[PDB]
């Protein structure tokens, strides 16, 4: 499908977890669940950012549009 490549994603996941905590075990079916959720989240965020961009009489989406989406959703940003 349109999923991100497994091994670089896994390496990032293991790297970040190593910074959060040490020696934790993470299984394969756990990472695919996280990846489906992450890509769904990012695709939806890009949908809303695009809607904000089109609202602004533009065709190209900007970083500030993303920041607005995160501000209106109530997320700490």
């Amino acid at each position: 499908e349109l999923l991100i490549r497994k091994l670089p994603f896994q390496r990032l996941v293991r790297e970040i977890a190593q910074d959060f905590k040490t020696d934790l075990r993470f299984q394969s079916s756990a990472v695919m669940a996280l990846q489906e959720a992450c890509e769904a989240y990012l695709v939806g965020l890009f949908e809303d950012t695009n809607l904000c961009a089109i609202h602004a009489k533009r065709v190209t989406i900007m970083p500030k549009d993303i920041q607005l989406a995160r501000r209106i959703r109530g997320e700490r940003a």
Binding site: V59, M62, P63
Partner: protein
């Protein structure tokens, strides 16, 4: 690391999201946003793991963790 989320991958996600034109600075911005998201989710997942003390993260545990992070 964060650089493994390549520029063409983010572009493909944006194409699926209906975006026709993409500013060059979005990609670095998107990477930062993604990192924050991942950190938060994993923090909760490990908390559940420690409460169970199984020390092996169950796949079903993560799905419930992922669900509660979203809502």
């Amino acid at each position: 690391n964060i650089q493994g989320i390549t520029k063409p991958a983010i572009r493909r996600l944006a194409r699926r999201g209906g975006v026709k034109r993409i500013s060059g600075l979005i990609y670095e911005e998107t990477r930062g946003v993604l990192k924050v998201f991942l950190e938060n989710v994993i923090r909760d997942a490990v908390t559940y793991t420690e409460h169970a003390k199984r020390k092996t993260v169950t796949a079903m545990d993560v799905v419930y963790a992922l669900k509660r992070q979203g809502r």
